[PDB]
Amino acid sequence: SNAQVEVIVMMHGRSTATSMVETVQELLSIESGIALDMPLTVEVKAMYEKLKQTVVKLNPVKGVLILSDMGSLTSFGNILTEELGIRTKTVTMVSTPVVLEAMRKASLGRGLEDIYQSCEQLFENK
Amino acid sequence: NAQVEVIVMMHGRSTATSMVETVQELLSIESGIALDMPLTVEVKAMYEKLKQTVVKLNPVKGVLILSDMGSLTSFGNILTEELGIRTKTVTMVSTPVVLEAMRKASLGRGLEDIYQSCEQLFENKY
């Protein structure tokens, strides 16, 4: 039922992504945005599988923006666009203000290109 | 054990904790200190407890604060002014920088060199 870019935050560790999303959700009073945490017990395989199941349920007509930190998580999106045909952008080295910007703009209905760029700018500025 | 103390300071219930703990488990080290600021904690209470945490750690080589956004970004300057302890602050902290930061600190590198190490990640992103 999509007027929005779906924003997925994927991070190493038990709750980095969850805590960041739960925080941006309270700051903006919004219910969008998805957290996928991969602790060191979950394989890269299994986690990519989880990304797949996840996206598929969100109706990503407007695309998916992946917010990631480092490593393999960083390349998932491109692999997904490849495998599933779903438009994707990834940002790496993500922190709270970035999640904040992304979920803010997504929920105003901005394009995937537009929200991606917004973020890369948070870095260019700092 | 007398190294640069790395304090990760973040918004949310466990962004900081989860980051510190991933990195500790990645490097099998026990150092690094997490401070989480949920919405139920006021800025002033957060600075107090940072202050009390730091006094107790007894840093002999300076303290490096890793933070996301907002007032947490200036706690570093204030703490130094208030007690004459040398701090530097990185803002927009992401797991890779907590990783680099705790790694080098573990090696016994100085504040200045670690700080520029983290700074250089954003540069090398760019």
Grouping H, G, I as helix, E, B as strand and the rest as coil, residue B40 is coil
The contacts of residue A18 (CB under 8 Å, 6+ apart) are A35, A37, B14
Instruction: Characterize the bridge pairing of strands B33-37 and A88-91.
Output: unpaired
Per the CB < 8 A criterion, the answer to whether B4 and B109 are in contact is yes
User: What are the chain B neighbours of A22 within 8 Å (beta carbons)?
Assistant: 12-13
Q: How was this model experimentally determined?
A: X-ray
Resolution reading in Å? 2.3
The shortest CB-CB distance from A14 to any of B12, B21, B94 is to B21
A21: closest CA of chain B, how far (Å): 9
| CA B91 to each of CA A31, A54, A79, B11: distance values in angstroms, whole numbers, following the listed order | 26, 31, 30, 12
CB-based burial label for B95 (10 Å; 0-12, 13-18, 19+):
buried
Per the CB < 8 A criterion, the answer to whether B86 and B62 are in contact is yes
Per the CB < 8 A criterion, the answer to whether A122 and B96 are in contact is no
* Of A2, A124, A104, the residue nearest A114 (C-alpha): A104
Per the CB < 8 A criterion, the answer to whether B86 and B114 are in contact is no
CB-based burial label for A83 (10 Å; 0-12, 13-18, 19+):
exposed
What is the torsional sign of CA A83, A84, A85, A89?
Answer: negative
Structure tokens that stand for A2 in this block: 């999509």
| Cβ neighbours of A27 (radius 10 Å) | 15
Residue-number span of the structural domain to which B78 is assigned: 1-126
> A26 vs B36: CB contact, 8 Å cut-off?
no
CATH of the domain at A40: 3.40.50.510
Structural domain count of chain A: 1
Q: Which of A23, A28, A99, A103 should be substituted to probe chain B, the one whose Cβ sees the most B Cβ atoms within 10 Å? A: A23
The contacts of residue B76 (CB under 8 Å, 6+ apart) are B65, B67, B87, B88, B89
> B69 vs A26: CB contact, 8 Å cut-off?
no
Q: Which of A12, A29, A73, A126 should be substituted to probe chain B, the one whose Cβ sees the most B Cβ atoms within 10 Å? A: A12
